[PDB]
């Protein structure tokens, strides 16, 4: 018997200066008891709108709340890069309280090829019998990229794990780190370790690479 707050879009790419609109729809009338929150990745949430159209003290006038019956809309007249965040509606019209599922907003910049490097495993690591190879794609955009490990010109599969930074609030760029992991024995079976990068900013797939043992 809860007010459902149904937010959408689940996500949003938009250019700087654009108008962006996020809509939350209350399964029951919640008067104007709606507050909106900004949350940059790994901070707490910050209050934006209270009572569905009152701009909380200190919030940039580009943000604004609005109500139309049971349908609430947050608006950014003109995106800054800072406004990379996840946005949540809340209703405190009645307990239990309720949040939207959030909307991840993303900056949109001109294309940036990754800076690429490759790291052959540390010598302490090899004594402990593990061997992890790191490939690093630095400060690029759009976040969509394709990394491929090849060991002795053999495409690997399932034995790498990558992870990406959050969009830079300033650059609006990304950074990735693909990590092939092998048992020490499996690592001493091959010479060449390559990291093939296919990004939109690259007009040709970059490969950093190394051979085992070279100084």
């Amino acid at each position: 018997s809860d007010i459902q707050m149904t937010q959408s879009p689940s996500s949003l790419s938009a250019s700087v200066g654009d108008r962006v609109t996020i809509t939350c729809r209350a399964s029951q009338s919640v008067s104007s008891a709606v507050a909106w929150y900004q949350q940059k990745p790994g901070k707490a949430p910050k209050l934006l709108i209270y009572s569905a159209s009152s701009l909380y003290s200190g919030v940039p006038s580009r943000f604004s709340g609005s109500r139309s019956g049971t349908d609430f809309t947050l608006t950014i007249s003109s995106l800054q890069p800072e406004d990379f965040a996840t946005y949540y509606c809340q209703q405190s019209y009645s307990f239990p309280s309720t949040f939207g599922q959030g909307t991840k907003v993303e900056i949109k910049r001109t294309v940036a090829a990754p800076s690429v490097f490759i790291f052959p495993p540390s010598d302490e690591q090899l004594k402990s019998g593990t061997a992890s190879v790191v490939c690093l794609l630095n400060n690029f955009y759009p976040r969509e990229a394709k990394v491929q490990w090849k060991v002795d010109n053999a495409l690997q599969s399932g034995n790498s794990q990558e992870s990406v930074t959050e969009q830079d609030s300033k650059d609006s760029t990304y950074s990735l780190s693909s990590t092939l992991t092998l048992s020490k024995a499996d690592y001493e079976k091959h010479k060449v370790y390559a990291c093939e990068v296919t990004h939109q900013g690259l007009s040709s797939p970059v490969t950093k690479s190394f051979n085992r043992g070279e100084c």
């Binding site: 707490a44 949540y88 800076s115 790291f119 690093l136 990590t179 190394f210």
Partner: protein, 222 residues
Amino acid sequence: SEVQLVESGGGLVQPGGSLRLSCAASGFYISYSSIHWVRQAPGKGLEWVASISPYSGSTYYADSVKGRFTISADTSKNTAYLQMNSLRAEDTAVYYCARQGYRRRSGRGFDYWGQGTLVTVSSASTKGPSVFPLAPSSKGTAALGCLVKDYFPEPVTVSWNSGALTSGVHTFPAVLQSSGLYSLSSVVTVPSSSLGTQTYICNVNHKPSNTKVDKKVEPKSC
């Protein structure tokens, strides 16, 4: 302007276990405000948990924790608490403490949040991180970092040079090793000149295991 909320009493707890989160207030009195707990599972959304309303102590609970959690406030200690019993996996989250603003000022909006404290309901035993260095190669800037490998639970903190170096640094999100443990790696890029003369130490701190390591990242020895 000391308005602050400082949660604590989180951590790694066996399933079915109990924890009592504490939340300490500054620069205002909680006797005059409604106080709410809100939790966020990793990469998930916000989820209101409970709240206790001023002057009456009346408590309200999200229905997913109704009867396992008990929000309460101590006037004297300017603290609010959440006893949690019969914890399950899905109770895993960061648990935030929020002040509901003064009506004449900010409606029923939550105007101050804690940094939040992280509750990791599993039974898999803690293990600290084995940090390995990542050296630069020979290629006007190059990159160097640390590989913080096979630890549990989140979180680790990495700083460089005791936070002296801060620019150009990327610390990647931990991913979950098939081993169930966390691994991650922090990297900074620096100009190729400083290699010879600039010592580069990453500082790794894994408070869950009481582990702190400092790893000097030096270039190719040969």
